[PDB]
């Protein structure tokens, strides 16, 4: 049995988030939580929130046990971008992109 939790339209570039995601791939949930607690990155808070939600879904919907769960799969996907204008010198204008991403976490008893 597998349980899925997602966070779509997160305000962070996929490249920055992917650094944290690779840290907990394939690890146990108990060990994964400790690692995220002592990581000084903004994306760590975002990923930790999603992982906790997936764990809760397993008990309520599937009736699983914490001791047998581990992070089977994890990946990050790019989302829509927002266009903005930044004035420059001598009357020139520039385009600014504010990227977002989708975060998916899969936990299973395997």
């Amino acid at each position: 049995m597998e349980t899925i939790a997602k966070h779509r339209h997160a305000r962070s570039s996929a490249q920055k988030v992917r650094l944290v995601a690779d840290l907990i791939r394939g690890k146990k949930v108990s060990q994964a939580l400790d690692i995220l607690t002592y990581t000084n990155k903004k994306a760590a808070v975002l990923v930790k929130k999603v992982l906790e939600s997936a764990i809760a879904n397993a008990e309520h919907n599937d009736g699983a046990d914490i001791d047998d769960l581990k992070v089977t799969k994890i990946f990050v996907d790019e989302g829509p971008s927002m266009k903005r204008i930044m004035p420059r010198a001598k009357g020139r204008a520039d385009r600014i992109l504010k990227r977002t991403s989708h975060i998916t976490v899969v936990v299973s008893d395997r």
């Binding site: 650094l19 690779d22 840290l23 400790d34 690692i35 002592y38 990581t39």
Partner: protein, 56 residues
């Protein structure tokens, strides 16, 4: 000042091979409170080496 050719995606990955970060190898356990904490750091509840430092 500027490039003459477009770098490939393969080259971009090669430069990025040193950007991976490292996790904490391990963390200590308090002697009295029993909770986990960073080595040489105060615990969340205010303990340190079982001395109960100020926890305001």
């Amino acid at each position: 000042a500027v490039q003459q050719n477009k770098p490939t995606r393969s080259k971009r990955g090669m430069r990025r091979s040193h950007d991976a970060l490292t996790a904490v190898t391990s963390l200590s356990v308090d002697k009295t409170s029993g909770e986990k904490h960073l080595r040489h750091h105060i615990t969340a509840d205010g303990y340190y080496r079982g001395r109960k430092v100020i926890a305001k």
